[PDB]
């Protein structure tokens, strides 16, 4: 069974996002499981935002044209280089860019690592299939109190588990990388996404298919929550929700 939790403190809507330094055009650091599970936090912490319910990433670099500067959808880049409907671009694909596109935090989405944490609250008991439609550049998803982070300890340093629910670590990988978790209604499941980009475009389309077959994509409002740490809440961890002994 996947470990879940019952935090007793004030629930907040959305995930916390911590941002950490990642070097432009470093294509090797994020290829390692240890880095993606926890090593990212040994680099400089850039900052954080909270309360985020729209969690998909779709970062497009600028195209500087005489008609102005506009983000170029990845699929519209061509040549050496232009953007369809904009002509040739005067700016490089290969430098850092500053934007608030990631969760409103002003940083360099071209080169950054971020950690999303929160608790997923299943409305229905059954099999949930999480998916990343594509990954630019490297990402993991972990679900469970022994795999994502410890119950009632959302804000602590990362745990060392490499038992990822979705392993999207840059070796490129196929599209539509998926991992399934059997979940019991009403229990709060620790959830961690770590995402990294080294250059240019960044993409992580996150979705989950519910037991009833419906798909929730990008906007996880009503499903994801945060709690401030309470390391003193003795009963918080539920190692096997299918054998929890009290009334939920
Ligand atoms: Na990229």
UniProtKB/Swiss-Prot annotation:
What superkingdom does the record give?
Answer: Eukaryota
* Compartment list: Cell membrane; Secreted, Cell wall
Q: How is it used?
A: For many industrial applications in which the yeast S.cerevisiae is used, e.g. beer, wine and alcohol production, appropriate flocculation behavior is one of the most important characteristics of a good production strain. The ability of yeast cells to flocculate is of considerable importance, as it provides an effective, environment-friendly, simple and cost-free way to separate yeast cells from the fermentation product at the end of fermentation.
**What does the record say about domains?**
The number of the intragenic tandem repeats varies between different S.cerevisiae strains. There is a linear correlation between protein size and the extend of adhesion: the more repeats, the stronger the adhesion properties and the greater the fraction of flocculating cells. The Ser/Thr-rich repeats are also important for proper cell wall targeting of the protein.
Which residue intervals define the domain PA14 in the entry? 50-222
Annotated function: Cell wall protein that participates directly in adhesive cell-cell interactions during yeast flocculation, a reversible, asexual and Ca(2+)-dependent process in which cells adhere to form aggregates (flocs) consisting of thousands of cells. The lectin-like protein sticks out of the cell wall of flocculent cells and selectively binds mannose residues in the cell walls of adjacent cells. Activity is inhibited by mannose, but not by glucose, maltose, sucrose or galactose. Also involved in cell-substrate adhesion.
Q: Which residues are glycosylated?
A: 111, 163, 235
Which stretches does the entry tag as region Sugar recognition?
172-213
Q: Which family does it belong to?
A: Belongs to the flocculin family.
* Protein name stated in the entry: Flocculation protein FLO1
Changes after translation? Extensively N- and O-glycosylated. The GPI-anchor is attached to the protein in the endoplasmic reticulum and serves to target the protein to the cell surface. There, the glucosamine-inositol phospholipid moiety is cleaved off and the GPI-modified mannoprotein is covalently attached via its lipidless GPI glycan remnant to the 1,6-beta-glucan of the outer cell wall layer.
**Residue ranges of coiled coil:** none
């Amino acid at each position: 069974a996947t470990e879940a939790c019952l935090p007793a403190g004030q629930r907040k809507s959305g995930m916390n996002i911590n941002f950490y330094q990642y070097s432009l055009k470093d294509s090797s650091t994020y290829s390692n499981a240890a880095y993606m599970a926890y090593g990212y936090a040994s680099k400089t912490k850039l900052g954080s935002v909270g309360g985020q319910t729209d969690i998909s990433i779709d970062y497009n670099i600028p195209c500087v044209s005489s008609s102005g500067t506009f983000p170029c959808p990845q699929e519209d880049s061509y040549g050496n280089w232009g953007c369809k409907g904009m002509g040739a671009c005067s700016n490089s694909q290969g430098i850092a860019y500053w934007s608030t596109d990631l969760f409103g935090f002003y940083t360099t989405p071209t080169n950054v690592t971020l950690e999303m944490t929160g608790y997923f609250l299943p409305p229905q008991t059954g099999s949930y299939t999480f998916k990343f439609a594509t990954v630019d550049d490297s990402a993991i998803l972990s679900v469970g109190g022994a795999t994502a982070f410890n119950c009632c300890a959302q804000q602590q340093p990362p745990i060392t588990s490499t038992n990822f629910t979705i392993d999207g670590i840059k070796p490129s990988l196929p599209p539509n990388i998926e991992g399934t978790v059997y979940m019991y209604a009403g229990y709060y499941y620790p959830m961690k996404v770590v995402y990294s980009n080294a250059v240019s475009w960044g993409t992580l389309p996150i979705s989950v298919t519910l037991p009833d077959g419906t798909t929730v994509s990008d906007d996880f409002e009503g499903y994801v929550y945060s709690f401030d740490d309470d390391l003193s809440q003795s009963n918080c961890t539920v190692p096997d929700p299918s054998n929890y002994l009290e009334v939920l």
